Structure 1
Amino acid sequence: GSHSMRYFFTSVSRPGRGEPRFIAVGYVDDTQFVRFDSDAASQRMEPRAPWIEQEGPEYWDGETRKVKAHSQTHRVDLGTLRGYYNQSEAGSHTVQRMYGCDVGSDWRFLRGYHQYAYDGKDYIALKEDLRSWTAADMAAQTTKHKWEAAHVAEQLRAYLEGTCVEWLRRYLENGKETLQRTDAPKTHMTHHAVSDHEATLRCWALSFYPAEITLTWQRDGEDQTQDTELVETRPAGDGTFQKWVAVVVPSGQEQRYTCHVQHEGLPKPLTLRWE
C-alpha cells in the first residue's frame, strides 16, 4: 500500500522567562519513531521505535543538531510574529510546522508538503508543485518574499523528492517486520435496548493497523447514515487503532442492518450482522 513520513513541530512561548517549550515528533505511516522534548533531560533526538535503534551515533548526532536548529528558528519566529501581529509580551503563542512526503505502493514519490501555522491558523504552506507558496495574510506574504529570495522552496523540494523518500524507504526496509505488516481489524457487534421500541447496534473494529479504515451501515442493502454515530479513530496504546459505528433501529428489525468494514489488511470487505 502507500506510505508516508511526517515530522510535526510545536513551539509554545513562555512569557516572563526563557525559551519556548519545543516538541518534535517523527512518524512513518502511523508509527511514531523519534521525538525531541525540550523539557526532557537528555537534549537529544530519542528513539521511539525499535527499528530506528539500528542507526548509529552519527545519526543521533545529526538529528539532534538539526532538531535543535529547528527549535532555535521557531524561537526567533515567535518574536518576529509577535512583531508582525503587534502583540504584547504578556501572552503565550504557538508555532506549528509539519512536513514530509507520501509514496505509493511502488515506494515512488507521490507528494510532498511543508506547512506552517501561527496560533492555530494557516500562515504559509508550500503548494503541491513544491515551487511556490500559499500565504494567508499580509504578514505571511512578507515571509513568502523572504523565502522566495532565499530559495526555500528549492531546498525543501530537493529534500521532499530526495532525502525524505530515500530515507522513508530505508526505514520501511529496516522496520519491515512491523512497518510492512498490516493488522486486519478484529470485528464484533453489540446490542443494547434503550426502550421497548428502540435498540442500538454497535459495530466494533479493534487492533488494526494502519489507522485508515471505513465502517458503514446498510439497511436492506442500502447505505444508511441517518440515526448512526461514528467515533473518531482512536489509538489503542499498543501501536494499533480502534473505531466503532452505531445505528439506532426499531426493536425486532435488527436483521435488516448489516455493518461493512474496509481496511488494507482485509483482502475482501467484511460484513457483520446481529443474531
Structure 2
Amino acid sequence: TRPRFLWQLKFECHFFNGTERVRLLERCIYNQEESVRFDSDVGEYRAVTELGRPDAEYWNSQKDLLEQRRAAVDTYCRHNYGVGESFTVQRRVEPKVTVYPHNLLVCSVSGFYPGSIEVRWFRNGQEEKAGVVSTGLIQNGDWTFQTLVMLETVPRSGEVYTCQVEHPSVTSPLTVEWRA
C-alpha cells in the first residue's frame, strides 16, 4: 500500500514537587525521528538531527517567539497544571483487593488510581519479600491500574497469610487475609 509520511508535535510539561520545578520540552518528530526541540532549560531551540538545523536557526532568530516559548513554563505548563489539578493530581480511586490460591497465593489489586502503590505479603504477621512475583504496574487506559502480587508458599495448617496494600486513596493500609 502507499508510503506514509508522519509529522508529530509534542509539548511536554514536566512538573517536580507540585509546581515548584517546571520543565517544558517542545519536540518535533518526522516519522519516528525527532528533528528539533525547545528545552526550557536550554532557553532556545536546538536541532537533534541535521533536518531540524534549518528550523532551529530560523526560529531562534524570532525574539518574540523565543520570549514566548520561554515564558510558556508559566503561561502554559503552570496554567494547565492548575486547570486539571482537581481531577488528575488529586484523583484518588481505591483499589479492590482480593486474595486467593506447594502453593501460589495471589493478591489482586485492581481499579486503583494513581499508579503509585505498595503491596506487601505477610506470613503470620512477618513480612516475606522472597519468592514474591508480580505482573508489574498495569495501566488499563481508563485512568485506572491493576496488579497481581503472588507469593510462592508451603501453607501449613494454621498459618495466616495477609496482603497489605498502601495507597494514597486510603489513609490506613488495606489488608485482606487468607487462612490455610
Q: Would the alpha carbon gap of residues 259 and 122 (structure 1) be closer, same or farther in structure 2, given more than 3 Å must change?
A: farther
The residue aligned with 2:73 is 160
The residue aligned with 2:27 is 115
Deviation at 1:225, TM superposition (A): 7.9
Paired with 1:94 and 1:251, the residues of 2 have a C-alpha distance of 55
Match of 1:127 among 28, 33, 39: 39
Q: What is the TM-score of this pair, normalised by structure 2? A: 0.68
SS at match of 1:235: coil
Match of 1:148 among 60, 66, 74: 60
Deviation at 1:129, TM superposition (A): 1.3
Task: Give the stretch that moved more between structures: 92-101 or 133-142.
Answer: 133-142
SS at match of 1:212: coil
Deviation at 1:217, TM superposition (A): 3.6
Sequence identity of aligned pairs in percent? 13
Match of 1:189 among 73, 93, 98: 98
Which consecutive residues of structure 1, in runs of 5 or more, have no partner in the other structure?
1-14, 16-89
Q: Does 1:205 align with 2:107?
A: no
Paired with 1:159 and 1:128, the residues of 2 have a C-alpha distance of 9
Match of 2:153 among 250, 253, 257: 250
Given that residues 35 and 50 in structure 2 are in contact (C-alpha distance below 8 angstroms), is that contact kept between their aligned partners in structure 1? no
Given that residues 228 and 247 in structure 1 are in contact (C-alpha distance below 8 angstroms), is that contact kept between their aligned partners in structure 2? yes
Paired with 2:88 and 2:134, the residues of 1 have a C-alpha distance of 33
Whose helix fraction is larger, Structure 1's or Structure 2's? 1
Q: Would the alpha carbon gap of residues 227 and 165 (structure 1) be closer, same or farther in structure 2, given more than 3 Å must change?
A: closer
Given that residues 132 and 152 in structure 2 are in contact (C-alpha distance below 8 angstroms), is that contact kept between their aligned partners in structure 1? no
* Segments of 4+ moved more than 6 angstroms: none
What pairs with 1:1-275 in structure 2 (closer than 5 Å)?
Answer: 90-101=2-13, 110-129=22-41, 131-133=43-45, 135-151=47-63, 152-166=65-79, 168-169=81-82, 171-172=83-84, 176=86, 178=87, 182-192=91-101, 197-206=102-111, 208-209=112-113, 211-218=114-121, 220-224=126-130, 227-236=133-142, 240-252=143-155, 255=160, 258-263=163-168, 265-275=169-179
Deviation at 1:230, TM superposition (A): 1.6
Deviation at 1:96, TM superposition (A): 2.1
Paired residue type of 2:92: D
Which consecutive residues of structure 2, in runs of 5 or more, have no partner in the other structure?
none
Q: What is the TM-score of this pair, normalised by structure 1? A: 0.49
Paired residue type of 2:140: R
Q: Would the alpha carbon gap of residues 200 and 150 (structure 1) be closer, same or farther in structure 2, given more than 3 Å must change?
A: farther
Paired with 1:148 and 1:106, the residues of 2 have a C-alpha distance of 30
Given that residues 101 and 109 in structure 1 are in contact (C-alpha distance below 8 angstroms), is that contact kept between their aligned partners in structure 2? no
- Per-residue CA deviation, residues 55-90 of structure 1 (Å, 9 max, x unaligned), is xxxxxxxxxxxxxxxxxxxxxxxxxxxxxxxxxxx5
Paired with 1:166 and 1:124, the residues of 2 have a C-alpha distance of 25
